[PDB]
Ligand binder design. Structure first.
Ligand code: J9B
Length: 164
């Protein structure tokens, strides 16, 4: 069902994550971690303290799709396993310092064609697929977007609810 999912999304905050390549999203799904640039890292740390759930919605640039969504389980933390991110052009490993732990809620894809009816008030009511890395998505838009993804029956949200 969708009842536990709706409970996790209650009063959540949502952020669009834009990755330049598929390898980093695959790594994030395997290891339960994400790293972003310092401007977005500061925003996510503030949001994590402010809301019962902070949801990252992932899209690989040029894929025409979202690749899933996950809930922050921690603020960013430095020191340890230099996650073997595949660095794009103007990207250092010091920029991707700061590792958040995340719990995946859905690892299934959603094509942009399915979200064309959803606009984001925090980005001028442009279609929710449009936005820079770190763009916040308003509650109602974000909730509806997450509910469009195919159910991921491999995930049990019982443990996620207990983190809350
Ligand atoms: C593991 N984290 C990330 N991995 C990848 Cl491949 N792209 C990311 C990531 N975070 C933001 N972006 C998009 C981007 C923003 C500004 C400059 C560049 Cl070159 C790319």
């Amino acid at each position: 069902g969708t009842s536990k999912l709706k409970y996790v999304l209650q009063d959540a905050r949502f952020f669009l994550i834009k990755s330049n390549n598929h390898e980093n999203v695959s790594l994030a799904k395997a290891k339960g971690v994400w790293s972003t640039l310092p401007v977005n890292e500061k925003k996510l740390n503030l949001a994590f303290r402010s809301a019962r759930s902070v949801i990252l919605i992932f899209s690989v640039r040029e894929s025409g799709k979202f690749q899933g969504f996950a809930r922050l389980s921690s603020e960013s933390h430095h020191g340890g396993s230099p996650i073997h991110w595949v660095l794009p052009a103007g990207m250092s490993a010091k920029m991707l310092g700061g590792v958040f732990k995340i719990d995946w809620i859905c690892r299934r894809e959603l094509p942009f064609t399915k979200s064309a009816h959803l606009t984001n008030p925090w980005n001028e009511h442009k279609p929710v697929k449009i936005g820079r890395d770190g763009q916040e998505i308003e509650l109602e838009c974000g909730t509806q977007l997450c509910l469009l993804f195919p159910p991921d029956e491999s995930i049990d949200l019982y443990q996620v609810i207990h983190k809350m």
